Design a protein around this ligand. Structure first.
Ligand SMILES: N/C(=N\O)NCCC[NH3+]
Ligand SMILES: N/C(=N\O)NCCC[NH3+]
Ligand SMILES: N/C(=N\O)NCCC[NH3+]
Ligand SMILES: [Mn+2]
Ligand SMILES: [Mn+2]
Ligand SMILES: [Mn+2]
Ligand SMILES: [Mn+2]
Ligand SMILES: [Mn+2]
Ligand SMILES: [Mn+2]
Lengths: 314, 314, 314
């Protein structure tokens, strides 16, 4: 199967500069080379160049709506294109608001996909419920069919078409939800495993449930949107919104190891890596390495080991 | 329901200076303000002023018996008073020896309470079994009915009345128990979940058991005495007696999260926070922050999120 | 029952200087005195003096084969001798290549023993499948009957006799396995619990399974070969090959606590402690202390506590 890495050095999704450097960092760590060592064919599409919308006035509270809307529309085009060619797309973030187009594009080619969202945050605030106008905290609100029209249209997002329903998404790692958001997920009946459920059940039982819940009936393409801030700050400190008591390096790899095993991984997002937010160079190396490892894990690398078929090492 | 914060800036329960500053640190973090943001009514009673007993000679090995005895007597009066007004009492330590009065007062108004003791220690040494005369390590020995008269009376504790039996207490996090203590808990049949039981069972099953064991028959008021050194030193390093391999930040919040859900929380103790024992300012912030979080967790705050009832965020 | 500590200050099993200082560090921490405090009789045999083979030319890629071969031959003699006298042998390493003779000797007296190998590495590379000629990474390859003759004879190991089969060994902690090794363990059907299986199952269910798998049918002597690099670097940083995402301090003690309870522990190895690899004195103290703790745990010390029989502490 083929893999296509797509860089999305975007940052207007939130106030902290640096996320745009995310893709450069991840590549600097050899993410592309290390992937070629797997059983997948890898092609790097390079980084997309986002045209900056001049005079992007705030919509009520939302910030840089036109810049974010255009960047995502551009990405969705590219993702749809690679998915059409039957390749698995791997989007390297900036911030998480690039998920709007990543999932959208994907949806265009595979309308029956399910979303597994590893994050400490739900990112489901609507333009009306955000305390900050930061869109990196509103991606899912633009994608949910059930949330259609429950908020005014936003300059630059007209092209978006709610592609997934509250039934096609599962959150893992939830632990810093806003009141509005918590209302939304309880009201819409969205399935989620907050840190307290992971503690109660074990990462193993959790993964087991999420699959029977999203794949119980029909086997379908999987879109993994992975917010690096889902793991505990001790593992991925280089993020804009770290929250303590998160997923461990082990749990993170388990999730990715389980999703590879399903053979259904169709789309991936490695978001929020911010190379400039590392307090010590090591903290950045820690964060990038982890991200890289998780990605490699998504495509085959197991902790038990890997050996090439048909080769007799004896 | 109402909450009453009572400061117990006491430290003669042990040899390390600084615990008395515990309450000041905890408040300095907004513990009171953050609580008000919950669905409970909060009233800060302020810190109690403990009169220092002059010429407090050691009773055999026990140190500052009269000072500790008087300080607890005073606190028990105050706790009894607020419990009477049907308010939930939240005691902010210095050292754990203030648990004698905190639970005693509580017991006077609710004689059918059960105690959940999260600690790395049993604190059940008798005046006869302590290697050190430190009373912060003997609190439960003064409160257990089964231990009545199994040791000589101590100057300043005459007022104490053993209020709870070996059947009304459950330990969670045990991992540094003295021989004498381990004899006591094995002999008396006290229920406990040492770190090995947590590892074997999972924090989830543990909490489940402790409840069916203490509430299986009669639902009763719950007194949570939380020694911050029950969590691993990596989370709460600013304590006098840190012991490696303890409960994680996650497991701590799960305990508090489950106890809130029972709706039975009647009394609480956040002990051993010692702001002067942090090697770096951060270590102290870490420790205070997690103590604050645990407390907020006891009164509602969930990691999955919180939203105000009757408010339509849409 | 009697214990016999045997020092193996050997290091030619790998490139890094220092491991030979392992036994000295462990004693320096009071390992022998602390053991005497247990219900076992302890006898320190002292450190073996290994004669250095001059002109030890590399066998193809394998390094210092004659020195490693002779050192292990000597140890196997000593271990055989103490096992014969019905004592439990506890070998203190240098590197893990000393397991060859540790297990070999053991096997001579107890040919029906099973091996529990806690390590982040399988150490099953053959002289033909090593990227480095480091023998500390080929111990099991010299001990497995199924691997006999699957590689050329190595100068210094003629005395070795494959004593255990792929059925008598269980790995716990695997997370950095080479391709050749992963082929070998998959091909031979070797039972293992890589970090992903620990995450999935929980240390408790893992220990449960390894026992029914190795002791389900016949109860037999147990040889615990413990590579300190099996725990995460945050617990035992002073080792030549640390790999992140390893077993926790708690999980390590659980394993040892469960093995003690079986009453079958017959041989032990505490390998890879390298006092010179600690970045800060504390890192070395951390690593030594936890190795000492694990060892004490193997012989009785429980985290729930210990009291002496027939003594009435009341
Ligand atoms: N880092 C965040 N999502 O990933 N923050 C969202 C903040 C909610 N307004
Ligand atoms: N920190 C302690 N308890 O909470 N220490 C008790 C020491 C036993 N004498
Ligand atoms: N530390 C290691 N095993 O314990 N390394 C083995 C390297 C494989 N050649
Ligand atoms: Mn997030
Ligand atoms: Mn996010
Ligand atoms: Mn304690
Ligand atoms: Mn205590
Ligand atoms: Mn190893
Ligand atoms: Mn090893």
């Amino acid at each position: 199967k083929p893999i296509e890495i797509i860089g999305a050095p975007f940052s207007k999704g939130q106030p902290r500069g640096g996320v745009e450097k995310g893709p450069a960092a991840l590549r600097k760590a050899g993410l592309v080379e290390k992937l070629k060592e797997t059983e997948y064919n890898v092609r790097d599409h390079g980084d997309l160049a986002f045209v900056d919308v001049p005079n992007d006035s705030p919509f009520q509270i939302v910030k840089n709506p036109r810049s974010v809307g255009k960047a995502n529309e551009q990405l969705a085009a590219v993702v749809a294109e690679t998915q059409k060619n039957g390749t698995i797309s791997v989007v390297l973030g900036g911030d998480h608001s690039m998920a709007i187009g990543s999932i959208s594009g994907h949806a265009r080619v595979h309308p029956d996909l399910c979303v597994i969202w590893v994050d400490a945050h739900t990112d489901i605030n609507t333009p009306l419920t955000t305390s900050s106008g930061n869109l990196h905290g509103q991606p899912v609100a633009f994608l949910l069919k059930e949330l259609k029209g429950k908020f005014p249209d936003v300059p630059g997002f007209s092209w978006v078409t709610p592609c997934i329903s509250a039934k096609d998404i599962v959150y893992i790692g939830l632990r810093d939800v806003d009141p509005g958001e918590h209302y939304i997920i309880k009201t819409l009946g969205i399935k989620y495993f907050s840190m307290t459920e992971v503690d109660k059940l074990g990462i193993g039982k959790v993964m087991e449930e999420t699959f029977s819940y999203l794949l119980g009936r029909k086997k379908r393409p999987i879109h993994l949107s992975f917010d690096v801030d889902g793991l505990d700050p001790v593992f991925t400190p280089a993020t804009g919104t770290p929250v303590v008591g998160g997923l461990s390096y082990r749990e993170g790899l388990y999730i990715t190891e389980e999703i590879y095993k399903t053979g259904l991984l169709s789309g991936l997002d490695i978001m929020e890596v911010n190379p400039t937010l590392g307090k010590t160079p090591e903290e950045v190396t820690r964060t990038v390495n982890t991200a890289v490892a998780l990605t490699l894990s998504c495509f085959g690398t197991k902790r038990e080991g890997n050996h090439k078929p048909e080769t007799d090492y004896l």
